[PDB]
Amino acid sequence: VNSFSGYLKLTDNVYIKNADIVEEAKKVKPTVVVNAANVYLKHGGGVAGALNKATNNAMQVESDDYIATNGPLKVGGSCVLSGHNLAKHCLHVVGPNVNKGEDIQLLKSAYENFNQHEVLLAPLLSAGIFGADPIHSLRVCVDTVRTNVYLAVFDKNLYDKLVSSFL
Ligand SMILES: COC(=O)[C@]1(CO)CCN(c2ncnc3[nH]c4cc(F)ccc4c23)C1
Numbered sequence: 001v002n003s004f005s006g007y008l009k010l011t012d013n014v015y016i017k018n019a020d021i022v023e024e025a026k027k028v029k030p031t032v033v034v035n036a037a038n039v040y041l042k043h044g045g046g047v048a049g050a051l052n053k054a055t056n057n058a059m060q061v062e063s064d065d066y067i068a069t070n071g072p073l074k075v076g077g078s079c080v081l082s083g084h085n086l087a088k089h090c091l092h093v094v095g096p097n098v099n100k101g102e103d104i105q106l107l108k109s110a111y112e113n114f115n116q117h118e119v120l121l122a123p124l125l126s127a128g129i130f131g132a133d134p135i136h137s138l139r140v141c142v143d144t145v146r147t148n149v150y151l152a153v154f155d156k157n158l159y160d161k162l163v164s165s166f167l
Pocket of ligand 1: 019020046047123124128129134152154158
């Protein structure tokens, strides 16, 4: 038993809700919140800009030190950093950005990072400003993640569509 509430169950291990991940994170304090990161951990907009704003820019400060030490992430890769006031940990995962021409097949590799964590609160990778089809992203999520994932979908219209079209 865990503290996530109001989710619809899609599969044995995947759950979905219409929610603001920042507010969902603020109430649940999950062990892991996933950020829709880029390779530079520049949290300017989308989910990343919202999560970072909710941390009063502490996420960005921590991220800049991470990059200065380690260099950029790989597309499809991830790193674990602090969850600040939102979660114990933040798993920064880089899905491919279609608006940069990145290979959508890397989306499966991106979701594989979730399997290193037993339970996660997450957005749909490569959705939103990353330019992928959220329905495809949901399919890859279901077919790749084996751990327990609670997907927060900000847009109510999109949430309803994802549910109605789910196979
Ligand atoms: C149509 O696709 C989308 O909604 C996205 C657009 O890039 C992709 C994923 N995403 C989010 N997903 C779950 N919670 C979210 N809270 C947010 C707060 C913000 F200020 C901005 C975005 C989100 C957000 C936004």
